[PDB]
Structures are given as structure tokens and as C-alpha cells.
């Protein structure tokens, strides 16, 4: 159906395509962040925000993927295929999951405008080669 | 996070357990309906509704699962494990995907109130013993 | 019953496990700090603050646990069981005790707002990658 | 440090020594009384009273000591030392726990004035030799 996860929020896969893989914390770290910061709201019966909605749905998807991984580890006889499926799930799907968790948590924290400006500036920085860009990337922080 | 995907909309996993698993249409049929009725609103850059948001996220998760299934069919050589994984994905995960797609499409089309009343009425129907269970099961309609 | 030591102050065990366990100072350091800064108020006959009340109760519980440890050392003869009990007490009970002492001392000193924001920021920091977080760890300061 | 559990409220360990140790009910009975009368206030996120603030901490200390007792029963293999530890806990630390529970539940149910007057009157009654001691001891009541 050609749907973009972030077009509804004012971003675009081509905008977050620049952030590397080493930019996103682990899935456990991002889930702990989401819990400690917005658990009372995600477990709430209210439409608190589209970010909350999408974040709930993504957490449910990841839970079902973990269920799949456990089922595989328990029900597959071939260790090669089992490990291959589990590694695919974790690495590749969690890359997208981390991307989405980061986007939504960071937006809820800072602001849509702030996050999009950070994305533009980080793209400017990461497109520039090292010989002509500063060595320290831009930084989004509450400190 | 103990999150319920229907609590922000007014239902629960216990109110939708009134409906059996063989009740929900196919993922093919539900995606056909979703396209035909809300393609231009799901592809839109707007929080048209929390239902639209959740439905976008669910469709994206299902697309990622289909990608996983194709990747499995390609890479995994063990036919037993390949078929096991594909069948688990489809049957199990698509069961929940059908529940979610049904809930959101039906709500968008008819009303949260109508869908909850339909759930309680279908519970009445399916609990009624067959000797007094009418054959004309409840059904959602606009007419 | 289901009582949380912190939800009357505006925190949570989840929000204090958001920081590492190797972050919290030793029980002796925290007791020295408590003495130095608030001895006259903890020994005072006044509800100076809920923080003072909770800190009094915690210090008394830790004193009773140390009494238990000495009683074990002098009565129990099996060195295995003796050392095992003392180690359990110290490690496990002191983790919680020093989390609580840290929370309450730091609150009395800086502010509930400051301490909660510090928890959030330090967790996000220690979870963020180095190349994209500030390089210096956060720290509370009255200076 | 030298902290008194009761001078913050208007009593002392000496004013409570008028009551014998045989006087205090079981920890089970006092926790039942608490769960009956102030459960929804001890489980609340509010500084309802210093009495609640202290009773929460005491209940948590007791829970941790019960956890220690179970951990000992499991991880120890010298029943002599195991029983020594459990008995010491339940008797020695239980006496203080039930003193504190009595004091707080009473000052919450009746009041500081009533409880202190009761302590003084019971001291009179119990210092009075038996030959001149009425049987109608002072008994806290709202009737
Ligand atoms: C195997 O299923 C048994 C019945 O499960 C019903 C449980 O009720 C909650 C299910 O709700 C959902 C629906 C969809 C989903 C997501 C969005 C994760 C989609 C999926 C199943 C395609 C991964 C998660 C939970
Ligand atoms: C393999 O990594 C590629 C990097 O990402 C490229 C762009 O991907 C777009 C991200 O889109 C999605 C799609 C689905 C999801 C959900 C929420 C369904 C979660 C997932 C990945 C666990 C299935 C998240 C982001
Ligand atoms: C063995 O009993 C001797 C009687 O001693 C009573 C006077 O000592 C002070 C009592 O005050 C208390 C009350 C409670 C406590 C805490 C809160 C630490 C609870 C406990 C006893 C469960 C560890 C500590 C001291
Ligand atoms: C190994 O410990 C794990 C860390 O657990 C952190 C969460 O702890 C939940 C209980 O919290 C507390 C905190 C303090 C306390 C007091 C103050 C009573 C002191 C103690 C730990 C000496 C009993 C009791 C329970």
C-alpha cells in the first residue's frame, strides 16, 4: 500500500536513511527508556499521542517477533537455520525497530521541529567527507 | 510494558475473545478492504485517526513478516524448517493480524460503539446453546 | 501489600533501576554524607520532611540489619552459612538501601525535579552511544 | 546515629517501655489491621501522613526480612543456623516491628493525645501492684 512510517509525523525514510546503524541504542536500551519515561501513558486507555499509538504497536510487533524467535529455538531441528532466522530477526528487524523507537521517543522528548532539524544537520554532517567535516557529530541531548 | 492494543480504543483482549479465531477473514481480504476503502488516507501525511496510525503500523509489520518469509524461502535450504517457519508466521501471526485489521477497519467503517455492541451481541449469540441459537449470526452493516 | 518506597515522592523502582547498580555510592559514604549534612534534622523531634522520615526509618532498618550481621557472626558457627548470610545482606539489601539513601539525600540537597531529571538524563546518556552523546558523564552540583 | 523512631511524633522508646513485650499483638494481626484500615492510603502516591510514610518503610523492611528468611531456608543446608536466623528475625526484629505497627496504627485510629494518655494510664495500672490493681485495664476504644 506504499505507506511510510514517518510521513504522518513529518519525516521520511530518506531523511532517517543517513543515521548509521551505530547511532541507535540497542532494542533493550530503547525499550527500557520507553518504559521508564512513558509507561503510565503507554499502558493508559487514552489516545495520548500518535507517537504513543505507534510506539505501542511497534512494541507489540517486537513482542510477537520475540515469540517467533523462542518458538524457532524450541521447534527447529537445524541449528544453522535456527540461528540464521534468529540473527535475521534481531539484526535486521531490530535496526528498523530501533530507528522507530528512537524517532518517537526523541520526538516526544524534544519536539518534531527539533528532531527534524537535527536530522537535516546530521545529514549535512554525514554526507560531508571526514576531511572536510568536523570530527564530532551533532548531538541531541537534554543536558 | 503490559500494553493492550485495544485499550486506547475501548476494547480489550477479553472483549474480542468473544469472537472465535475462525471468525476473522483472511489477511488478503482484510488488506483488500483496507486498500479499497482507505488507501488514500493511509498513504496520507496526516494523523487522520489513531485507527489509521495503528493500521499503518500493522500493515508495515505484516510487510516485514512477508519479507522475512521470502528471505527464509530463499536462504534456508532445510525444507522442514522453512515450511515450519512460514506456516507459523502465516497461521499464528496472521491470526492476531486479522484480529487487529478487523477491529480497526470495522471501527473506521461503522463506529467504535457499533463494534463494541457487535462484540457483546456476538458473545450472546455464541454463548446461546444451538437449540436456541438463531442461524443468522450478527453482522455489521450500514444499511 | 503492594507498596512502593518512592511513588509518594514521585519516582519508581523502574526509574531507579534505570541507572546502573555500579553507580550508587557505598553505604558508608552515604551515611557519612547524611550525618554531615542532616544529623541535627534527623535527630530532631519534627516532621521536617517526608524525606527525613523515610531516611530515619531506612537508617534504623540498616542498623538492625547490621545488628543481625554481628549476631550471626557471634552465634552461628558454620563459616559458610555465616559469610553467605552476611554477603547476602550487604550486597543485596545495601543495593536497595543505597539507592534509597542516594535518592533522599540528593533530593534534600538539589530537588525532586533535579533528581528525577538527572535519573532520566543519566540513563539516556549511558544508553546512548559515545560518538553521539556528550563525553562527560552527568553529575549533580550545588556549585 | 542516635535516632528515635517516635520522637518525631511525640513519644519515646521510654514512654513505650511502660507497655510490656507480652502486650503487643502478632505481626500478622497488625498487618491485617493495616490492610483493613489504611491499605488504600499506604498504596497511594501521597504524603497522607508521617505515620503512613513510616509504616510503608517498616512494611518494606519486614518484607525484605521475610525475603531473607526464605533465601536462607533455600540456600542454607545447616538447619541449626537456618532456624537460628529465622527465629532471631521473627522474635527480635518482630518485637520492634510490632511495637512500631501498634504505635502507628493506634495514633492513626485514635490520635497522639489518646495514645500518650493511654500509655501513661497503662503505666500507672501496671506499676500498681496486683493487690490494688483493678482488672479493668485501660483499653483503647472509640466506644
Ligand atoms: C496466535 O494468536 C492467538 C490469538 O491472539 C489474540 C491475542 O489478542 C491480542 C492480539 O492482538 C494483536 C494484533 C496484532 C498485533 C501486531 C500489530 C503485532 C501484528 C502481527 C500479529 C502481524 C505481528 C499484535 C497483537
Ligand atoms: C534492515 O534495516 C534497514 C534499515 O531501515 C530501513 C528503513 O526502514 C523503514 C522502517 O520501517 C519500519 C517498518 C516496520 C516497523 C515495525 C514497527 C513494524 C517493527 C519491526 C521492524 C520490528 C517489524 C518499524 C519500522
Ligand atoms: C527485640 O525488641 C527489643 C525492643 O526494642 C524496642 C526499642 O528499640 C527501638 C524500636 O524501634 C524500631 C522499630 C522499627 C524498626 C524498623 C523500622 C527498622 C523495623 C524492623 C524491626 C522490622 C527491622 C527499627 C526500630
Ligand atoms: C539486590 O537488590 C536489588 C535492587 O532492588 C531495587 C528495588 O528495590 C525494591 C525495594 O526497595 C527498597 C528500598 C529500600 C528499603 C529499605 C530502606 C527498607 C532498606 C533495606 C534495603 C536495608 C531493607 C527497602 C526496599
Residue numbers in the entry:
A (entry chain B), B (entry chain A), C (entry chain C), D (entry chain D): 1 to 143
Paper text:
Next, we looked at the mutants HBc-P5T and HBc-L60V, which have a low secretion phenotype. Previous studies have shown that CLPs of both mutants are structurally almost indistinguishable from wt HBc with the exception that Phe-97 adopts both alternate rotamer conformations with similar occupancy in HBc-L60V. The maps of both mutants with added TX100 showed TX100 in the hydrophobic pockets at the same positions as in wt HBc and in HBc-F97L. Phe-97 in both mutants was in “conformation 2”. We found that TX100 binds to the hydrophobic pockets irrespective of the secretion phenotype of the HBc variant.
